[PDB]
Amino acid sequence: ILTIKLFLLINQFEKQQIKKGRDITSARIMSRIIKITIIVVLVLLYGEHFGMSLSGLLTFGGIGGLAVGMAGKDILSNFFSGIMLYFDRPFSIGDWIRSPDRNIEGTVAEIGWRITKITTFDNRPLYVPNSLFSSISVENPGRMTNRRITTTIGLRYEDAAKVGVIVEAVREMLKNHPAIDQRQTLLVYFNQFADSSLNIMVYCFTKTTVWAEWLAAQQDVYLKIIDIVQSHGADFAFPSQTLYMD
Amino acid sequence: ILTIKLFLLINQFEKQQIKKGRDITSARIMSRIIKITIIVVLVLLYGEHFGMSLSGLLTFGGIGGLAVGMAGKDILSNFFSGIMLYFDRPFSIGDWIRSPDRNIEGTVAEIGWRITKITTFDNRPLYVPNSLFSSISVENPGRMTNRRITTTIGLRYEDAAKVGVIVEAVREMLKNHPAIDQRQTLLVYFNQFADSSLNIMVYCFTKTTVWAEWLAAQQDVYLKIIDIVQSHGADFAFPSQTLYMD
Ligand SMILES: CCCCCCCCCCCC
Ligand SMILES: CCCCCCCCCCCC
Ligand SMILES: CCCCCCCCCCCC
Ligand SMILES: CCCCCCCCCCCC
Ligand SMILES: CCCCCCCCCCCC
Ligand SMILES: CCCCCCCCCCCC
Ligand SMILES: CCCCCCCCCCCC
Ligand SMILES: CCCCCCCCCCCC
Ligand SMILES: CCCCCCCCCCCC
Ligand SMILES: CCCCCCCCCCCC
Ligand SMILES: CCCCCCCCCCCC
Ligand SMILES: CCCCCCCCCCCC
Ligand SMILES: CCCCCCCCCCCC
Ligand SMILES: CCCCCCCCCCCC
């Protein structure tokens, strides 16, 4: 009676799946697989009150279950990581995230039970297995507090006598700029010797976190830097070489 | 009687396989393998009602099954991932897919139980084991909503006084173009200092998602950009060097 009821349930499931609008042969194969595994489970369970062997059945069931357990590790890992994300996740729907270990950069769209759906900046869907979030570091640029501006000013080696005044002028301009966060790091210093130029580092932050406003402020700062450099008699350096003719 | 029936079934299977048009010796070897494993299973199962040892049989069967379970992990993994794809797959037949972790780029042709068949853009078949889709991120360019246009304009360092007007003109042209999606990101800004040029970024989207129309729109935009740049008295920059002669 139990077998008949289970077979009726499987047949009803197959009929509903076909009604849902899917392939015939695939549905039949799935039904056959479910029937086979149901029979195996019943035999492993009812192999004593009806069957005779004990040690053989125990060993066969044990080895089968051991193989099944080893084979299905990844799907179960995805499911468990989905549960963990449901209880504790370091992001929300609509958050821009990325990682230094894998390529998952984009905006979160859906958090499912097996995979997480992410919309890339190319406007494409990306499906990430949930088990990744248990082993990689996740960064959340969607929750930043400031945008950083960094650049390098490369002056010619003949302009070594103007580095101090140029650095002072650039620092003053950055200190008096209305778009720069004065409570963050602000560094302008002659930093290193390069192959063809003397490099000056620039390091600051903007109050805004919006893409377009940050880009506009950066462009304004760069143009002001160009004006400052050219007003003191210095100039930017191309790659340079010394040639001995023969 | 059970052994005789099983051997008859195996012989019938071998005869049918030969009738299907395959090698003789291979069929005989497969039949021998199936016979050997059937005998082993029967001995492990019927080793008490006929046999005598219990602990030895249990240990032998356990170690054999443990080795078999470890060895057959990958095939079972492929089968289980095929089942999971049957129930939940992030693509359909005819979808263009790719991945940042492996090389699987192409169009989906068949989704089998062990492998998935993909037609590459080289017009070649590619067979991907199903277990890959449980551990790698899958991207679906076949479901995009827009095509992105990105490029860089590199002006000479002597054209620093025209960057603002050139950026304004390019932004206006992009805003008035009939092929550009005005509801998406649209950025044109002086972006960075390069070794030989001042770089301007361009970032926009097209309404269409068709390959040929996107390429045509991109070509039109590039030609318009060239005209805009050359009309303001600026020019594109070749790689540059400063040479000191001796
Ligand atoms: C009408 C809903 C039918 C749902 C069928 C679920 C089948 C689960 C099989 C589990 C085998 C261990
Ligand atoms: C062609 C449809 C029937 C395929 C049956 C496959 C059975 C595989 C059994 C493997 C036992 C280790
Ligand atoms: C035609 C359907 C064939 C289904 C075969 C299922 C075989 C499962 C083998 C599991 C080994 C542990
Ligand atoms: C929406 C219905 C989900 C049904 C899941 C069935 C799982 C069958 C597992 C078979 C393992 C051999
Ligand atoms: C129509 C399908 C014929 C082949 C079925 C093979 C079933 C093998 C089950 C093995 C369980 C361990
Ligand atoms: C082998 C383990 C399979 C586990 C499948 C769990 C599916 C849960 C889905 C819940 C929402 C549909
Ligand atoms: C099987 C995996 C279960 C994971 C459970 C995680 C529970 C986290 C609780 C955090 C509370 C703030
Ligand atoms: C006429 C169809 C014959 C199918 C033979 C299947 C053999 C399965 C062997 C399983 C050994 C555990
Ligand atoms: C040449 C045809 C017969 C080959 C027999 C190989 C048997 C290998 C047994 C290994 C036991 C560990
Ligand atoms: C000529 C056919 C030889 C077949 C040999 C099968 C040996 C199986 C060894 C399995 C060890 C666990
Ligand atoms: C289409 C017929 C499929 C038959 C599959 C037989 C599998 C034999 C497994 C032997 C393991 C030692
Ligand atoms: C014609 C084949 C002769 C060799 C057969 C060797 C069988 C070894 C079986 C080992 C089972 C563990
Ligand atoms: C060692 C495990 C082998 C499992 C083989 C399953 C084959 C299923 C095929 C169903 C469609 C032909
Ligand atoms: C042995 C692997 C079984 C995998 C079953 C996955 C079930 C997913 C259900 C999703 C419903 C939308």
Residue numbers in the entry:
A (entry chain B), B (entry chain A): 89 to 334
Manuscript text:
To prevent cell lysis, bacteria have mechanosensitive channels that are gated in response to the elevated membrane tension and release solutes, restoring the turgor within the cells. One of the medium-sized paralogues is called YnaI, with 5 TM helices. Structural studies have shown that the main difference between YnaI and MscS are extended sensor paddles, which create a periplasmic indentation in YnaI, and much smaller portals in the vestibule that provide the cytoplasmic access to the pore. The TM paddles are in contact with the surrounding membrane and are therefore responsible for sensing the membrane tension, while the vestibule with the pore formed by the TM3 helices conveys conductivity and selectivity.
Closed YnaI was purified for structure determination by electron cryo-microscopy in n-dodecyl-β-maltoside (DDM) supplemented with 0.5 mg/ml Azolectin (condition I+ ), resulting in a 2.2 Å map. The model built from residues 3–334 resembled the one of YnaI purified in LMNG by Hu et al. with minor differences in the outermost TM helix (TM(−2)), which is frame shifted by 3 residues. In our model, Trp29 in TM(−2) is at the cytosolic interface of the membrane. We found that each sensor paddle has four TM helices that are interconnected by 1-2 hydrogen bonds to the adjacent paddle helix. For example, Asn8 in TM(−2) makes a hydrogen bond with Tyr63 in TM(−1). This hydrogen bonding network suggests that the whole paddle forms a rigid entity within the membrane. In the lipid supplemented YnaI, we could model eight C12 chains, representing alkyl chains, per subunit in the respective densities in the cytosolic pockets, yet we could not distinguish whether they were contributed by detergent or lipid. The eight alkyl chains formed parallel bundles with relative orientations that were compatible with four phospholipid molecules in a membrane context. Thus, the dispersed alkyl chain bundles were part of a hydrophobic inter-subunit interaction network that was located between the transmembrane part and the vestibule outside of the plane of the membrane. In the closed but not open conformation, the pore lining Met158 interacts with Met158 of one adjacent subunit and with Lys161 of the other adjacent subunit.
